């Protein structure tokens, strides 16, 4: 279970990381959430500091991906993970959108075929160090 940067994740793998949850979302489809790990991928949607809801509280540019979680993992998820909560996720499918974009896809999987799981780390863990650093660097800049 290797761990990988944002940064280098691509499409149609399956990958592993840790992440901050800037924004999440629930519908009657869904759970969405929106993380980075502050590395950015050439991929990944610009976040505009001009039209973003004045809500986001995450980096502009190519810095975040969605996440989007179905069944198992949305009703664990969409009454659970918080916005600025730390997750680690684990052998997540990776794609394109229909725009070209990457985006992260924890589907369906009752018979475990694929281990996949994301869960909630505290945010003391010495994990979560090098994207604190990172968002130190972002922010000071």
Known sequence: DSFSLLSQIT?????????QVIKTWYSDKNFTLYVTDYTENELFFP??????SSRWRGPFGRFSIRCILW?????????????????????????????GYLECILHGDSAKRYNMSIE??????????????????????
Request: some cysteine; glycine content about 2%; hydrophobic content about 25%.
């Open 120 to 141: 909630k780390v505290d945010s003391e863990e010495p994990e979560l160090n090098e994207i604190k650093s990172r968002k130190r660097l972002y922010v000071q800049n």
């Open 71 to 99: 069944d198992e993992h949305d009703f664990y998820c969409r009454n659970y993970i918080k916005e600025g909560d730390y997750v680690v996720m684990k052998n997540v499918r990776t794609k394109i959108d229909h725009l």
């Open 11 to 19: 499409p149609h793998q399956r990958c592993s990381f840790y992440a």
């Open 47 to 52: 976040m505009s500091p001009y039209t973003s």
